[PDB]
Every structure is written in structure tokens, then in C-alpha cells.
């Protein structure tokens, strides 16, 4: 079989969250940083990389998004670092309650 | 051409007689489909005819 346009999406996640990479899933990976479309045509590939990515003092170069006003769209990539407001108050600057 | 063969164009497996067409595919198109929606024409991927 041949393929017309091919894109490889490469990223690192916690091992528990590989299940969230399937289309039609929820959780902070599916909800907030990586969503696959319901009619996704492709394959998902993952392998345990503890021997490559881990660091004795803890490797903190790998980031995930924990807060979002709304679940993002399929194949959408949110780079924004703007602060998330959990309460009813607005929050400016860098930090707040 | 002109003989019955099990063809495979870009994975488009099938059985049928191949023949030189006069359909003019615009470049973004590779396959043509019938009223029955069965693929009836194909652009050969090595010699673009």
C-alpha cells in the first residue's frame, strides 16, 4: 500500500497516558494538548523510553498542559502559556491566588 | 495493456483489462471513478499517462 501525505507527530508522555492517544478519548493529554480526530486514518506508535529520556535528578525538559478553558480540537497545538483562571476573579500579571 | 491482469496501482488492487485512455486528469487527480463509483481510470505513476 502507498500513502499520499504522511505526517509524523513526535512527543513524549507519561506511560499511563499512552491510552489517551487513541481517537475519541479524554484526560489531560486528549483534552488539553493532543487530540486525534474521530475519523483518524493512521497508526499510533509508542515505546518505553526510560533509558533515554530519564535523568537521575529528574528530567524536567518534557512539559504537558494541565489547564485549559476548553478541550482543544483534533490535531490542534496550543503553545500559549497565559495564566489559567480557576476562580471567578480575573488574574493579571504572572501569578495570583 | 489489452490483456486481463491483476493490477495494483498505489495499492489499488483489482482485476481488469488496462487500456490507453484519453481522459485528461488535472495534475492533482490520480484516479477516475464510474457512475457505479468503481475506479475506471488511473494515472500510471511512472509514465504519467
Amino acid at each position: 500500500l502507498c500513502f499520499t501525505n504522511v505526517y509524523a507527530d513526535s512527543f513524549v508522555i507519561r506511560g499511563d497516558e499512552v491510552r489517551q492517544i487513541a481517537p475519541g478519548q479524554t484526560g489531560k493529554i486528549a483534552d488539553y494538548n493532543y487530540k486525534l480526530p474521530d475519523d483518524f486514518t493512521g497508526c499510533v506508535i509508542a515505546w518505553n523510553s526510560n533509558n533515554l529520556d530519564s535523568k537521575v535528578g529528574g528530567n524536567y525538559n518534557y512539559l504537558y498542559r494541565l489547564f485549559r478553558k476548553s478541550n482543544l480540537k483534533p490535531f490542534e497545538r496550543d503553545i500559549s502559556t497565559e495564566i489559567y483562571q480557576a476562580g471567578s476573579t480575573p488574574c493579571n500579571g504572572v501569578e495570583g491566588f | 495493456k489489452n490483456k486481463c491482469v491483476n493490477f495494483n496501482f498505489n495499492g489499488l488492487t483489482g482485476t481488469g483489462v488496462l487500456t490507453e485512455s484519453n481522459k485528461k486528469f488535472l495534475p492533482f487527480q490520480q484516479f477516475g471513478r464510474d457512475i457505479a463509483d468503481t475506479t475506471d481510470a488511473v494515472r500510471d505513476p511512472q509514465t504519467l499517462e
Binding site: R14, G24, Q25 | -
Partner: protein
């Protein structure tokens, strides 16, 4: 539910009634880390609606 200091043995499995509350399951994303989460009567996406 998901943080109780001591869970029950499987033969004596516990059952708790959940009533008059809002199912905002987002609150536990930071700290849950579920290895298995499988729904059988609903799609997981729909739980909020």
C-alpha cells in the same frame, strides 16, 4: 473515592453511594494517573455533557 488511605479487600469489596454532587472529574487530572479507565455504557468524551 480515589485517595482513601485504606482500600477494601477484593473479597470484601466496598460500595459507596454517590448522590447530590457534580461529576467534575477534571479536578483529579493533576494527581490521578489512572493506568486503566474504560467505559462500557458511554463514550468517555460524553461524561461532562
Amino acid at each position: 473515592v480515589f485517595n482513601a488511605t485504606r482500600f477494601a479487600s477484593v473479597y470484601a469489596w466496598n460500595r459507596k453511594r454517590i448522590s447530590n454532587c457534580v461529576a467534575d472529574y477534571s479536578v483529579l487530572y493533576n494527581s490521578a494517573s489512572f493506568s486503566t479507565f474504560k467505559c462500557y455504557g458511554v463514550s468517555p468524551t460524553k461524561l461532562n455533557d
